[PDB]
Amino acid sequence: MSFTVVIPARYQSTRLPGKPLADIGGKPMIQWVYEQAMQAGADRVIIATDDERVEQAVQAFGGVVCMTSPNHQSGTERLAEVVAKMAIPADHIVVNVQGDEPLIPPAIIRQVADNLAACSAPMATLAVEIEDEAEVFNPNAVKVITDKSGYALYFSRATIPWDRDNFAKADKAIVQPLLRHIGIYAYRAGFINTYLDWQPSQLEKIECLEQLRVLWHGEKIHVAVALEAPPAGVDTPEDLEVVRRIVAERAQ
């Protein structure tokens, strides 16, 4: 089994402008993500960016970088262009890892690739078990449920499975965990064009969940519990200071 990791780097942010290049212990944020991907055993790692500053910084650590169009609308159109420009074969496993995750556990990057290779779905993703009321009823925490083979039945901002008996109480009891989707995906490279070209579903627009396109078109997404729950993506100066502390402590 071999797989390639593609990491989109988004330069623009009102809270952390130039985020991919934020210095963390002497390396830009994007380099840390790159290096987590290498530690996962990826045969190849590719930063996708539309900003020349990112290109230059990645070249300066010897990283592979693919320049993509500034006019893309979704991170799937972006991934599609990398697959085309870098000539990635249709059967090759690609893992999409967000460029704002410098502390992503390498084991889960490998996990999602391994899961895709082992199953009959063209796409694989992961979830974390949740049981705190905060996230269980939080529409920003996307819930997912699976069949006996691990294929997703549905993803939703609604609280799925609804516990009829325990959620009626008004003092809503949580007696078993739910599964919260995490934003890491593995695809057969050729499937990315299939996904891209499929007629958009109404479901995906109502829920604001792109992956519902796949379900609506009758195709499968494998889902597994992540081996280790990943830290949240870095969005603010406060989040960045937390990562700087963790990274500094990794040298102590």
Next chain:
Amino acid sequence: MSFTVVIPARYQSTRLPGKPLADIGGKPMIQWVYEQAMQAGADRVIIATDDERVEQAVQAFGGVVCMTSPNHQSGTERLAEVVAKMAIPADHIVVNVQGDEPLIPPAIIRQVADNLAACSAPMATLAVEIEDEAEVFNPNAVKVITDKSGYALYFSRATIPWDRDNFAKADKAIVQPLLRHIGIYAYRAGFINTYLDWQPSQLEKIECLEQLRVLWHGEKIHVAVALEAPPAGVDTPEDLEVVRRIVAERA
């Protein structure tokens, strides 16, 4: 196409006791459902009951009765007993119609049987579009969403699909309908036993939705919008009088 209709008619009811034998225009409620099933083109209609009062009454209008277990059974459990007891062949289509729907449109009984015959799936069912907030956010109203071919993705007591933008608002806006599942099923007779003997999912117990067992084992359930939206069933005395006046309005 040929199908059999099985109509469960439990006498005991907390909301309306002895309901299958509640009078409507001179006939017990059960007789009205039976007559609607006959109008649908059913090869055969079977009333499934565990009470001999229902048995006597159905035989008195000339209906076929199958006696089922007087112990607590689930929906599938009851239906599987009839299928097993009368040795219904595995490839025969069985439509399960509730004994408390005296005004069920014969056309939708035929629809669910037709839909099942038109595909390879072991199971078919129906839904109605809903927009009323009291139904949309009610866990007693089971929601369903389908793929592009009409196969169920999930059934839930949660409000699905969640409209991110519109349901965040203090007064939630319903800008497209949802689908409410209605309790009419068609199955391949043999599938019913498989369904019965399958390893149970956790999902089915949490949501209290038996049909999630099927989705968990990865088998398909086809779902279509009812060709005619059924009238309300009968759960309470109030509901009964609604039917009584509908029938009275005809004469």
